Write an enzyme that holds these catalytic residues in place. Structure first.
Site, short mmCIF file in Angstrom:
data_model
loop_
_atom_site.label_atom_id
_atom_site.label_comp_id
_atom_site.label_asym_id
_atom_site.label_seq_id
_atom_site.Cartn_x
_atom_site.Cartn_y
_atom_site.Cartn_z
N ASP A 36 0.78 -1.24 0.00
CA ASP A 36 0.00 0.00 0.00
C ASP A 36 0.81 1.29 0.00
OD1 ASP A 36 -2.02 1.86 0.21
OD2 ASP A 36 -2.39 1.53 2.32
N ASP A 232 -1.55 5.65 -5.40
CA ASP A 232 -1.99 4.76 -4.32
C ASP A 232 -2.32 3.33 -4.74
OD1 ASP A 232 -3.18 3.66 -2.04
OD2 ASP A 232 -4.77 5.12 -1.90
C1 314 Z 1 -13.24 -1.77 -0.91
C2 314 Z 1 -12.04 -2.30 -0.13
C3 314 Z 1 -10.76 -1.53 -0.44
N1 314 Z 1 -10.64 -1.34 -1.89
C4 314 Z 1 -10.56 -2.51 -2.76
C5 314 Z 1 -9.20 -3.22 -2.57
C6 314 Z 1 -7.98 -2.28 -2.60
C7 314 Z 1 -10.62 -0.12 -2.52
O1 314 Z 1 -10.52 -0.04 -3.74
C8 314 Z 1 -10.68 1.10 -1.70
C9 314 Z 1 -11.72 2.05 -1.93
C10 314 Z 1 -11.76 3.24 -1.16
C11 314 Z 1 -12.85 4.22 -1.39
C12 314 Z 1 -10.77 3.50 -0.16
C13 314 Z 1 -9.72 2.56 0.06
C14 314 Z 1 -8.71 2.82 1.08
O2 314 Z 1 -8.92 3.50 2.08
N2 314 Z 1 -7.50 2.24 0.84
C15 314 Z 1 -6.41 2.41 1.81
C16 314 Z 1 -5.73 1.04 2.05
C17 314 Z 1 -6.77 -0.03 2.30
C18 314 Z 1 -6.84 -1.18 1.47
C19 314 Z 1 -7.83 -2.18 1.71
F1 314 Z 1 -7.90 -3.26 0.95
C20 314 Z 1 -8.74 -2.04 2.79
C21 314 Z 1 -8.68 -0.89 3.62
F2 314 Z 1 -9.54 -0.77 4.62
C22 314 Z 1 -7.70 0.11 3.38
C23 314 Z 1 -5.35 3.46 1.38
O3 314 Z 1 -4.24 3.40 2.28
C24 314 Z 1 -5.89 4.89 1.37
C25 314 Z 1 -6.25 5.37 2.79
C26 314 Z 1 -6.59 6.87 2.82
C27 314 Z 1 -6.86 7.39 4.25
C28 314 Z 1 -5.58 7.47 5.06
C29 314 Z 1 -4.82 8.68 5.07
C30 314 Z 1 -3.62 8.76 5.84
C31 314 Z 1 -3.17 7.63 6.58
C32 314 Z 1 -3.93 6.43 6.56
C33 314 Z 1 -5.13 6.35 5.80
C34 314 Z 1 -5.55 7.69 2.05
C35 314 Z 1 -5.30 7.15 0.66
N3 314 Z 1 -4.84 5.75 0.78
C36 314 Z 1 -9.68 1.36 -0.71
#
Ligand code: 314
Length: 390
Positions: A36, A232
Site C-alpha cells: 500500500d 496509491d
Molecule cells: C473496498 C475495499 C478496499 N478497496 C478494494 C481493494 C484495494 C478499494 O478499492 C478502496 C476504496 C476506497 C474508497 C478507499 C480505500 C482505502 O482506504 N484504501 C487504503 C488502504 C486499504 C486497502 C484495503 F484493501 C482495505 C482498507 F480498509 C484500506 C489506502 O491506504 C488509502 C487510505 C486513505 C486514508 C488514510 C490517510 C492517511 C493515513 C492512513 C489512511 C488515504 C489514501 N490511501 C480502498
C-alpha cells in the site's frame, strides 16, 4: 533485468489488492501482506477473524518486543485497532536482509480484511508524516533503509490479467513485481519519465493537463489536484475530485455515445457485459494525464486505455460473457491514482531523488490497435500554480 529474485513476487488483482509474502518473528511466521503506497503503517492480523486463515502470534516469537501502546488507523474504507510492538521482519522474495520494524498487531477491525483476498496484513509504504499515532512511529521502509545497504527506492509493476481470475487461478497467477532497492529493466518498454514528489507524506504529484481522446478537459489545472493528487496502490479505482469526475464522465460518455450505458455503470456500481470477445474497446476513449516534469516548464503525459479503466469482473451468472465495472469514482479528498491506473505502468518510487517515474508496463493489457504510453516532453507554463494550497 537485474533483480530476478524479486521479479514476479506479487499476487492479487486490482479489486482485492496486490500482496507480497513476508515473515515476522522468530522462528519466522509467514504472512501475505497488502502493498500500500497510500498509507504508512505496517500492520498484521494478530487475532482470529472470519476472513483470516492465519495471523501473527506474538507469544510464539522470541524476538517480539511490546511497545505498551495502542494504535488506531481509519482508512477511507475500513479501519482497525491494534497493539504496537517491534519484531524481526524479512521478505522471502526480496532483499536478503532482516530488519527490526514497528508492527501494529491488529486485534479489532471493521471492513478492513477482504474475504478471499489471501492477505493478512498491510505494508504502508508512504512517509512518516501520515503514520499513526504520529510521525514518531518509523515506517517499515525507513527502517529497512536505515538498517541495511538497500537503496532508498522501490518500484512496482502491478499486472492486471485483463480477464476474471477465479479463486484458484488468482492463487496460482503472477500478479506483478515489487523491486526493493532498484529498477528492473525487463518490466517496462520505452523510456522512464519522472515527476517530482511534491511533498513527502503521501506520494504526492501534480497533474497539469487532462485529455480524453486528445480533447482537453479544459479545467483550471488546480482543480485536478484539489486538494491533492496521490499514487496509491491500496485503492482500486482512479478517483477524481467531484468537479473533475463530473467533467470526465460527461466527456467519456460523449466519446462512447454509440452505446448507451445505465447510470449504475457510470456510478461504478453495476457491471456491463458483452458476448465473449466482443467488448467494443474502440468506442471508449484513451485518457491522458499530464504530469509536471523535472525540468522547468516541462511536462510529460501518461496515457491509459479502457483496458485499464474498465475492471474485469465475473458475470453474476458466471456465463461466457466478458463483463466489466467502470473503475473511475468521485473523490472528496483529491485525485487518487489507484491500482487500475498503476496496472498500465511500471512505477518507480525514487525516494532518494524525491521523484516518481513512469514507463509503459511490459504487462499492461491492450489490443492490436492501441497501447498505453508515456510520452514527452511538452512545454508547460506555470505548473506550480496547479498545486493546491489550503
Ligand atoms: C473496498 C475495499 C478496499 N478497496 C478494494 C481493494 C484495494 C478499494 O478499492 C478502496 C476504496 C476506497 C474508497 C478507499 C480505500 C482505502 O482506504 N484504501 C487504503 C488502504 C486499504 C486497502 C484495503 F484493501 C482495505 C482498507 F480498509 C484500506 C489506502 O491506504 C488509502 C487510505 C486513505 C486514508 C488514510 C490517510 C492517511 C493515513 C492512513 C489512511 C488515504 C489514501 N490511501 C480502498
Amino acid at each position: 533485468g537485474s533483480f530476478v529474485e524479486m521479479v514476479d513476487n506479487l499476487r492479487g488483482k486490482s479489486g482485492q489488492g496486490y500482496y507480497v509474502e513476508m515473515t515476522v518473528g522468530s522462528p519466522p511466521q509467514t504472512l501475505n501482506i497488502l502493498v500500500d503506497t497510500g498509507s504508512s503503517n505496517f500492520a498484521v492480523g494478530a487475532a482470529p477473524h472470519p476472513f483470516l486463515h492465519r495471523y501473527y502470534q506474538r507469544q510464539l516469537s522470541s524476538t517480539y518486543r511490546d511497545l505498551r501502546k495502542g494504535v488506531y488507523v481509519p482508512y477511507t474504507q475500513g479501519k482497525w485497532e491494534g497493539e504496537l510492538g517491534t519484531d524481526l521482519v524479512s521478505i522471502p522474495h526480496g532483499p536478503n536482509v532482516t530488519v527490526r520494524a514497528n508492527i501494529a498487531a491488529i486485534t479489532e477491525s471493521d471492513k478492513f480484511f477482504i474475504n478471499g483476498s489471501n492477505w493478512e496484513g498491510i505494508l504502508g509504504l508512504a512517509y512518516a508524516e501520515i503514520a499513526r499515532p504520529d510521525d514518531s512511529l518509523e515506517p517499515f521502509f525507513d527502517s529497512l533503509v536505515k538498517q541495511t545497504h538497500v537503496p532508498n527506492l522501490f518500484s512496482l509493476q502491478l499486472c492486471g490479467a485483463g480477464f476474471p481470475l477465479n479463486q484458484s487461478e488468482v492463487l496460482a497467477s503472477v500478479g506483478g513485481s515489487m523491486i526493493i532497492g532498484g529498477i528492473d529493466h525487463s518490466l517496462y518498454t520505452g523510456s522512464l519519465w519522472y515527476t517530482p514528489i511534491r511533498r513527502e507524506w503521501y506520494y504526492e504529484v501534480i497533474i497539469v493537463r487532462v485529455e480524453i481522446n486528445g480533447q482537453d478537459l479544459k479545467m483550471d489545472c488546480k482543480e485536478y489536484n484539489y486538494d491533492k493528487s496521490i499514487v496509491d496502490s491500496g485503492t482500486t479505482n482512479l478517483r477524481l475530485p467531484k468537479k473533475v469526475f463530473e467533467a470526465a464522465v460527461k466527456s467519456i460518455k460523449a466519446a462512447s455515445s454509440t452505446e448507451k450505458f445505465p447510470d449504475g455503470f457510470w456510478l461504478g456500481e453495476q457491471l456491463v457485459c458483452w458476448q465473449a470477445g466482443t467488448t467494443p474497446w474502440n468506442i471508449f476513449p484513451v485518457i491522458s494525464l499530464y504530469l509536471m516534469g523535472e525540468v522547468t516548464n516541462q511536462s510529460f503525459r501518461i496515457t491509459i486505455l479502457p483496458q485499464q479503466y474498465l475492471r474485469p469482473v465475473e458475470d453474476v451468472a458466471t456465463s461466457q460473457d466478458d463483463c466489466y465495472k467502470f473503475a473511475i469514482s468521485q473523490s472528496s479528498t483529491g485525485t487518487v491514482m489507484g491500482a487500475v491506473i498503476m496496472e498500465g505502468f511500471y512505477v518507480v518510487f525514487d525516494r532518494a531523488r524525491k521523484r516518481i517515474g513512469f514507463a509503459v508496463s511490459a504487462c499492461h493489457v491492450h489490443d492490436e490497435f492501441r497501447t498505453a504510453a508515456v510520452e514527452g516532453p511538452f512545454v508547460t507554463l506555470d505548473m506550480e500554480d496547479c498545486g493546491y494550497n489550503i
